[PDB]
Design a protein around this nucleic acid. Structure first.
Lengths: 89, 102, 97, 94, 102, 97, 89, 94
DNA sequence: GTGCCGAGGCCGCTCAATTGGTCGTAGACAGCTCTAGCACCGCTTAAACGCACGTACGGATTCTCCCCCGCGTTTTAACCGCCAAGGGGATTACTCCCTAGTCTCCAGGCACGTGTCAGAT
DNA sequence: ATCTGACACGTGCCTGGAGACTAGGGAGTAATCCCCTTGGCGGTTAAAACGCGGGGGAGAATCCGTACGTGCGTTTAAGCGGTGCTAGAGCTGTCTACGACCAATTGAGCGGCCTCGGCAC
């Protein structure tokens, strides 16, 4: 489940807007299934002679699921998050 | 619609033109629970006797059914308007189902 | 659809089939609309129960719980986000009638 | 190099990175999962749940409500053409 | 169709009625290979510059396109026949595409 | 479909658009039918190439092979039984024109 | 691939009928994709507690994918093959 | 306990059990695959490809041809309503 | 304005997440080889485009039929609360069936090359 | 009748396929707690089914302009074929970055239970 992760972003984006418990469960169920469809995409594009999912595989898998404007804005946000993790570890 | 809590839009022999406006404002299921439980146990009884159905499983079975049924009827309305007609007939629903499975 | 309804078994009431049309936005409905609508729900419930029964049977249980239908729902490649919990049906929910 | 808390705080994210790593590894889709792939999938969910929450929050405020309901989520997704292409096959409110 | 040693089964100019029976007997694809390669490289030029396309990949790309296009048009013919008309128009094809994606 | 064609790019010829309608069993074709046909073939090839290119990028190759298209075909959940081997092109094959 | 196995079946059913080489490759790709759909169905129908696939998992997976008369005849053939294998180990 | 033959010969199946087990085990679905699941999967493929080959052979014989082609395999599928539902989403080669 | 039940807040209770090491191991990189994809010219020639003639057809119009929306009445069954018995889902502990792993052996299907006859013309 | 070149056949082999302990885990079984399911009863009463005028939507018939079938010729380019080049796949051989596994620890997120305020009439 992703209930506490979704509520924190709502507090950051909309400080005066809360979320129902039933609506939060549907948002968490979207977030779980969003990670599942990307995970299937990462395995499918991965070559058969490999056994590791790198960061580049998740980059290209999300570009197929997210078309045009969303896919372009996604790739910039992933790489910025990755390079923050690479210098703060 | 007949359960407790909320989720009902409008009652009292409300007219058909108002019914389209009201039904887009509600969020509850529109098939009765007791008739759906009798239906759900009857399908299982034809294949396996003495099957209990959970209350949580009954709600999620009904949500999938109406969401597929409304999606079919929305596709049936498109073919009706494509034939320059405003009344959904029996052949329009059969054509709408045939266009995706067949 | 046309011949999936049979006499002897319980079906949807006639008024609730017209309510399913009004949720879709239709204004006029023919008098022979109940037979295809009753057929499709009886087909979809027969499809969902048949998948759910084999998931329950393979786990050596006797009660169809929420995990059996969830495995039945995504076996048909249909994503479901309305998973019920113990707090379901509170004031206005997606599970009430 | 330093730790100063959890992985999600290190990558400056709000979706838990370690929970998304459990999604990849226990999926069974691959034998080995790199640490950089878990952070990338965490940023995948975090951005596009941010897009849904931003549109649902604006839809809830337009209806003079301070709590997001399931109807506001459905109206926000349908009003966006690009968001509907991803989760349009899903089941919302029957 | 213009490829050597292909089962085209068509003999020069034919009428519209005879073209339906002839095309139901053949198995070859009906878009020329040179113009399909030209389109295949042109779209790939917008993403990755100087990408070579294998001949085996071109055959699988064309087969998927033919089967998906014919399946749409068979669905587009049903909407035309459901509206008591015998002429497939531009609205019928756009309706058939919208009924599955949208 | 409606506006997926752009002036400046090579497109499907008009007689090839009509042959697509003949294989679908259509007896009469409108004169404005060439525009949605050209859009849909252009749209499906744009979808197929875009999925196949990122399959090539992850494998660090520069030529689109048959495996990259096959992985692009199964990514759209569309099974393909037409696999061109080295014996393709023999006589009346399905991969010919 | 299943090229040799499917060719030997055609000799048993129709002794005077051959098969195109291109037709044999398509029939083999049907066999691989039929194996993929049943195996993915068997993984789905397993409970979360169990981790291995027994014969009962494949039997129920074939019943779901194959409708009505084909599904009932499937279980009879699969069970008879297992019981024959279980006595000639 | 019969060492005179292979797994397919022990179960009297023409579909090789070893190749069907390779599809099941190396699908990335589960860690452990039993012996009985390999035999059962081979029998399920064998019975219904016997159904396709029986319909394709009758279609080829009715066309006065002794060789089964792609069109004969295709024409056998829509002539059976039960067989068409399994592979209706498949690309039958243009 | 007013009843009300659900999100927020507060109290414990874990076991998921984290660090720190060792260990093998899998992808990055370089270099050699050679199958195959691009290009082009000749030439062919099937095929696409355009144009004139004409006929079928979808749109427009009027008219008529019939059946479905609207309203009133009556029967009836879905649903509250609240009840109770109990069937089977979790949970834990014991026992043991078998299957991944490792080593050994072997022969069966697949590629290469060649005859020859099923089918298109 | 006459090709032809694709399928059937023969050969080399090496990598797929099978056989024999091992033991550790996961499947199966059984007892026990108690959570949630079935059954139902008084009463509601809102919803469902039924019946009756009445008008709007669909069907039928007629007419016609114009958009498409269809020969006919002109025009353009797809393909054989053969050629040649060479960009780049395939495979081999390190080796170093890097992920799994195991020991230990703790507090972030989990549930249970009040409690006041936002949504519904």
């Amino acid at each position: 489940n992703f209930r506490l992760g979704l509520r924190n972003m709502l507090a950051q984006i909309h400080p005066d807007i809360s979320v129902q418990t039933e609506a939060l469960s549907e948002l968490s169920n979207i977030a779980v299934f969003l990670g599942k469809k990307i995970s299937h995409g990462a395995v499918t594009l991965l070559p058969e002679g490999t056994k590791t999912i790198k960061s580049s595989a998740v980059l290209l898998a999300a570009g197929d699921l997210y078309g045009k404007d969303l896919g372009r804005h996604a790739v910039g946000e992933m790489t910025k998050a990755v390079t923050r993790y690479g210098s703060a570890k | 619609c007949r359960q407790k809590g909320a989720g009902s839009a409008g009652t009292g022999s409300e007219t058909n033109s108002q019914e389209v406006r009201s039904q887009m404002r509600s969020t509850c299921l529109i098939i009765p629970k007791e008739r759906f439980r009798t239906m759900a146990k009857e399908i299982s009884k034809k294949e396996g006797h003495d099957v209990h159905i959970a209350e949580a499983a009954l709600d999620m079975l009904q949500v999938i059914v109406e969401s597929c049924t409304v999606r079919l009827l929305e596709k049936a309305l498109v073919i009706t308007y494509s034939g320059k007609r405003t009344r959904v007939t029996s052949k329009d629903i059969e054509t709408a189902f045939m266009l995706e499975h067949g | 659809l046309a011949d999936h309804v049979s006499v002897g078994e319980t079906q949807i009431p006639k008024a609730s089939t017209q309510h399913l049309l009004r949720k879709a936005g239709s204004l006029s409905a023919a008098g022979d609309t109940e037979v295809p609508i009753r057929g499709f729900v009886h087909m979809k419930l027969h499809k969902l129960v048949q998948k759910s029964l084999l998931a329950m049977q393979l786990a050596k249980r006797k009660t169809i719980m929420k995990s059996d239908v969830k495995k039945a729902a995504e076996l048909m490649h249909l994503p479901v986000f309305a998973i019920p919990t113990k707090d379901s049906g509170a004031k206005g929910s997606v599970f009430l009638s | 190099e330093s730790k100063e808390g959890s992985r999600s705080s290190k990558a400056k994210l709000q979706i838990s990175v370690a929970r998304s790593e459990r999604l990849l590894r226990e999926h069974g889709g691959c034998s080995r999962v790199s640490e950089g792939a878990a952070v990338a999938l965490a940023a995948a969910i975090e951005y596009f749940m941010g897009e849904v929450l931003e549109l649902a929050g604006n839809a809830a405020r337009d209806s003079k409500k301070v709590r997001i309901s399931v109807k506001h989520i459905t109206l926000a997704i349908q009003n966006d053409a690009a968001l509907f292409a991803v989760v349009g096959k899903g089941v919302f409110s029957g």
